[PDB]
Design a protein around this ligand. Structure first.
Ligand SMILES: *C(=O)[C@@H](NC(=O)[C@H](N)c1ccccc1)[C@@H]1N[C@@H](C(=O)O)C(C)(C)S1
Ligand SMILES: *C(=O)[C@@H](NC(=O)[C@H](N)c1ccccc1)[C@@H]1N[C@@H](C(=O)O)C(C)(C)S1
Ligand SMILES: [Zn+2]
Ligand SMILES: [Zn+2]
Lengths: 511, 503
């Protein structure tokens, strides 16, 4: 079996490496004195007698693995023990040196070192070594766009929010909007790629004993599923950045136009309420309606666009199609067919309800607003290496299309900054770093229906808005026992990741 | 009449800088006998505000007033044909750069009185100036406009891709010391030398009060390739290696062992790749893997004495004497400084010093004076004199030169330079990554990445130094940032130079 190629972060830190280890094997029948062998092996390996005894006493199993991937020192003690029916064999370990880290990027391999999830699978052929015969050649390596420092800050912020919000799931993606490079992708609960079948979060512990042995592979695939690329969700008010960009690009907002909030608008015989319908926003300039997250104003902009223009921009921002991200099992969101869209559906779409997207779709779309209107193909793999760590080839950023003009982009970045300085994203304000973004709080869809007390809260951030270098999307899925708002659950995630990442990146503060 | 300057040509006699005859409208106010009637006519012809023209011709206290500068020949004979007593037109030559925003750090530009204030325009101001009208003598640059276009294109692409503070590339003919190309982004347009054409310069000029704007101008105009110093990083291992081999301190088939670190006194210098040490290495392989411990050992075997002699001999302590203005001269810790110096840290050079040093390795060991001016012409475009290639000294033997060219090729075929590999073209070179020295202190997340290429290594015809200064949002390594710049320039330039592929 040949070693797989090494997977590096963008600073050439090893994230996944094939290392030559030794495994302790046993044929029970060939073991003369089982208590004696168990005690010798147990002492060498530093394991409890009763556990090693239970392994080498096994019935009807002709060949038993006693312990995988022991170091050379302990493997030499086993050999030199000269025990019967007990031996050591060379065994390639697929080792992930940062452990419970970036599992939904890296993925993992089966027993035979075949990639079965994440980058390990997507680039299985590129990573595979060339076999030897009774010497093997290590496979070519990969350099990710992922930065282990930003990934750490992302994992840390997401793990904190998961505990604090007692959430079903917390997910964050950090993107370079200029290139579409993923800097970080974290979701909790997650798994350790060093031990892909051992749940390390109670949630997955409880989910794996709702399956019999025959069907446990289904529970494993559930735990290995990348929520950033495979799950869909109604994005809430973050989609108001899409509606705003579309409205400004189409010229449907007059300069100095005042929009009046009375707390509701009637469409299709239904009242669509402002969140603050008890205390109407009254007269608003457009900037102030985004700051206020005033639903009726977005209903009006949706109507001025109509179903056709609205669906053109949704398609153009990439929200009806896979992003083409180089990870396995991407979904493509859920949207009502354009020609069956009624007035109430159109009105809700205008503020991000009755449309489902992946997190990757939504961050990719928002990144085009932060990149002069250019939609980029997201990617995780930036470069290929030989088996000695030498770069052989690097991948160019791919511009898919211009969604909006440079002028609309600049106006939107000025509006996004004002949401964080003057509006509903104030919680995420960092002095000197010109953070912009938008919050969402959306009732959760389960089996095509809106369930009660179950929300998805999100915040998308862009920094710095004068020259965007990082976009962060954080999603808190079903926060429990807390103020369930985008600002209070997800805003602190984006603020922490932005604060730590911009200082790591050396972004100069401007006060 | 300030006479026409000499024309500046590329080496294929394409015009890069030429004086063109325009016309200026003059007034002697005490002879405009019918002022606002005379100023109504001139206002239309020149299309002026009817007031701005009157205001100028009705000046009580001036013997001569310039009405409008650099007007076209139609309007010149229109003004002559109106035969007003106090108003005429005179010739007035304008400097034009037909390629516009192209090799601005080589060409430079002039002030309104046709005096050169940067680049070749200033360095050769005397040679270019006309007789007071006889047009001045012209220059033929070593610059090739085709290779310059390949260099500008590669450097602009890298500037955008890497969101860098700056990208700089020099192409040199190692046999002659001739500069084939010198480009840097951001740069400026010598046709309009005070209007920033890059956001970066738009920002840096707005930081000065209008009164103090000159420090801003001279910052936009500064040629980073001759005036800016930097820490070369591992490209310096080509100097250290050449020096080691020339002194003979490397034994034939000697093996060097990497275990992630060395001990050069109590202080232990570690390798850059101590996570997976390189193990046992032929010298070739130490250079391919850029193994720091090996170059420390080589440094120790030379001593401070011989190291500093070789550095000086390669010209790295002295100006090159390139014929451009404002060249930087450039910038204690015992065996520890000696150790770090061995791979290009705590040592600062200009890009022109470094490419000149590497060029001597690629030219059988002959250090050459670099030059941008190959020939002089008359005022009619005939060549009168060619500047001879000037050897400064032999730094190493043809033997050491051949060994170093074999190693340089192996860096690109087998080692850290693989990104730049072109089938048939025998490229060699070395990557560098350094932390940026600012006012003497290393920063955080601030790297200068570089790649020096030599091709073909069996008969070198071109050396290219590419430097990406502060790449942003991307992996900061010589190979990924600077390697594609050299590859692109080498690919386009070797075909144009008519280098035959050998498979
Ligand atoms: C966008 O997400 C909007 N959300 C809604 O209108 C929901 N139907 C809602 C959920 C919870 C409470 C009230 C309404 C606006 N943006 C939200 C946010 O920015 O957090 C909001 C709650 C301010 S309303
Ligand atoms: C030569 O430039 C060396 N560079 C360094 O030792 C820097 N201190 C460094 C920068 C980034 C990461 C680790 C160390 C060696 N040559 C470089 C190159 O060829 O680009 C290198 C990164 C392989 S280390
Ligand atoms: Zn409202
Ligand atoms: Zn080493």
């Amino acid at each position: 079996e040949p070693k797989r190629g090494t997977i590096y972060d963008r600073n050439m830190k090893e994230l996944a490496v094939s290392v030559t280890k030794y495994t302790v094997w046993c044929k029970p029948v060939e073991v003369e004195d089982k208590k004696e062998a168990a005690e010798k092996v147990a002492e060498i390996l530093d394991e409890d007698y009763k556990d090693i005894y239970a392994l080498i006493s096994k019935k009807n199993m002709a060949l038993v693995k006693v312990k995988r991937w022991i170091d050379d020192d302990k493997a030499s003690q086993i050999r030199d023990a000269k025990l019967s029916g007990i031996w050591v064999a060379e065994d390639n370990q697929r080792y992930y040196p940062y452990g419970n880290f970036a599992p939904y990027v890296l993925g993992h391999t089966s027993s035979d070192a075949t990639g079965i999830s994440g980058v390990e699978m997507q680039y299985d052929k590129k990573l595979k070594g060339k076999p030897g015969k009774l010497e093997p050649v290590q496979g070519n390596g990969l350099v990710l766009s992922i930065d282990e420092v930003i990934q750490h800050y992302t994992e840390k912020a997401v793990q904190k929010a998961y505990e604090l919000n007692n959430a079903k799931k917390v997910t964050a993606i950090a993107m370079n909007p200029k290139t579409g490079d993923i800097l970080a992708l974290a979701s909790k609960p997650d798994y350790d790629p060093n031990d892909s079948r051992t749940p390390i979060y109670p949630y997955y512990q409880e989910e794996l004993e709702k399956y019999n042995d025959k069907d446990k592979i289904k529970g494993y695939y559930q735990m290995w599923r990348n929520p950033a690329v495979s799950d869909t969700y109604e994005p809430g008010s973050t989609f108001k950045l899409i509606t705003s960009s579309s409205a400004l690009e189409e010229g449907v907002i007059k300069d100095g136009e005042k929009f009046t909030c009375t707390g509701s608008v009637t469409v299709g015989g239904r009242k669509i309420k402002c969140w603050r319908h008890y205390r109407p926003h009254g007269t608003q300039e457009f900037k102030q309606a985004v700051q206020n997250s005033c639903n009726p104003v977005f209903v009006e902009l949706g109507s001025r666009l109509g179903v056709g223009k609205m669906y053109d921009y949704i398609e153009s921002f990439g929200l009806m199609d896979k992003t083409g991200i180089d990870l396995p099992g991407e979904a493509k969101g859920i949207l009502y067919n354009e020609k069956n869209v009624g007035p109430v559906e159109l009105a809700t779409i205008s503020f991000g309800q009755s449309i489902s997207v992946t997190p990757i779709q939504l961050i990719t779309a928002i990144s085009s607003i932060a990149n002069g209107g250019d939609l980029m193909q997201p990617r995780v793999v930036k470069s290929y290496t030989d088996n000695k760590g030498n770069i052989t080839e690097t991948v160019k950023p791919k511009k898919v299309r211009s969604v909006i003009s440079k002028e609309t982009s600049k106006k939107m970045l000025e509006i996004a900054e004002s949401v964080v300085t003057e509006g509903g994203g104030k919680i995420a304000y960092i002095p000197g770093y010109r953070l912009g973004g938008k919050t969402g709080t959306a009732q959760k869809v389960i089996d095509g229906k809106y369930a009660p007390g179950k929300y998805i809260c999100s915040f998308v951030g862009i920094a710095p808005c004068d020259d965007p270098q990082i976009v962060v999307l954080a999603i808190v899925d079903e926060p429990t026992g807390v103020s369930a708002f985008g600002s209070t659950t997800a805003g602190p995630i984006v603020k922490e990741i932005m604060n730590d990442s911009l200082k790591y990146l050396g972004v100069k503060p401007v006060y």
